[PDB]
């Protein structure tokens, strides 16, 4: 008997996968514990539609990122800060870079998404990765300058 798993299951298969079990097992265990469903046509359709729908929203995100690589990776973020010689008085935070990025350049971003461990404390040219999606990592070149 073919069923569709509703969960990962010890040496049987993975969720959404279609396996063949003895009808007793399906009827008297798997189905009553909500662990699986009959591989009927009427719910094979549905599984197909779920795989369909997930894959729509995955590649749709992997575009919303990729297209956001286009808006960044083609600019430099220039941040004027009060500083002497090369060391800054205050600092440039991620929360700053994000607030900077909207004001000029237009793009709105999430500070927390940006890969900045400790607030930048020296003037110069920085190359900072964004990660708005795993597998789609972005290069934000940021020039921190004086005045």
């Amino acid at each position: 008997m073919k069923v569709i798993l509703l969960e990962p299951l010890e040496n049987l298969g993975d969720v959404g996968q279609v396996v063949d079990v003895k009808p007793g097992y399906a009827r008297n265990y798997l189905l009553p514990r909500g662990l699986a469903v009959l591989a009927t046509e009427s719910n094979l359709k549905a599984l197909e539609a779920r795989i369909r729908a997930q894959a729509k929203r995955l590649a749709e995100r992997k575009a919303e990122a990729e297209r956001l690589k286009e808006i960044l990776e083609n600019l430099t973020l220039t941040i004027p800060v009060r500083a002497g010689e090369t060391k800054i008085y205050g600092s440039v935070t991620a929360k700053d870079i994000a607030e900077a990025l909207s004001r000029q350049h237009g793009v709105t971003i999430d500070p927390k998404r940006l890969a900045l461990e400790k607030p930048i404390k020296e003037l110069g040219e920085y190359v900072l990765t964004y990660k708005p999606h795993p597998e789609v990592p972005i290069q934000l070149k940021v020039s921190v300058v004086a005045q």
């Binding site: 009827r27 009959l38 009427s42 719910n43």
Partner: protein, 97 residues
């Protein structure tokens, strides 16, 4: 011993024929019937219990139509069934046949 709630399979009457002798096809003189008497052949009835709409419904059904009960459960998802009695649920289910 009785009637399939799904297929309508019911006990039927059959003869039990007793024979002695060697078939012609095997070079024997032929089969002789030493007895014919009536008997019944029953459906292979079994119980099938299922939760549908938070209630426990049970069917007495021929083994051949055991899958037909579960298919009925599937078709039942499209129904306002909650709060009915199990007699009433079973009726809605059967009505789907």
């Amino acid at each position: 011993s009785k009637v399939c709630e799904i297929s309508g399979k019911r006990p039927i009457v059959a003869n039990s024929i007793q024979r002695r002798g060697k078939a012609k096809r095997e070079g024997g003189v032929g089969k002789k019937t030493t007895g014919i008497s009536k008997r019944r052949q029953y459906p292979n009835l079994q119980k099938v219990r299922v939760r549908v709409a938070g209630q426990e419904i049970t069917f007495r059904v021929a083994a051949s139509h055991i899958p037909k009960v579960y298919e009925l459960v599937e078709r039942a998802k499209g129904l306002k069934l909650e709060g009915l009695s199990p007699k009433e649920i079973k009726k809605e289910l059967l009505k789907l046949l």
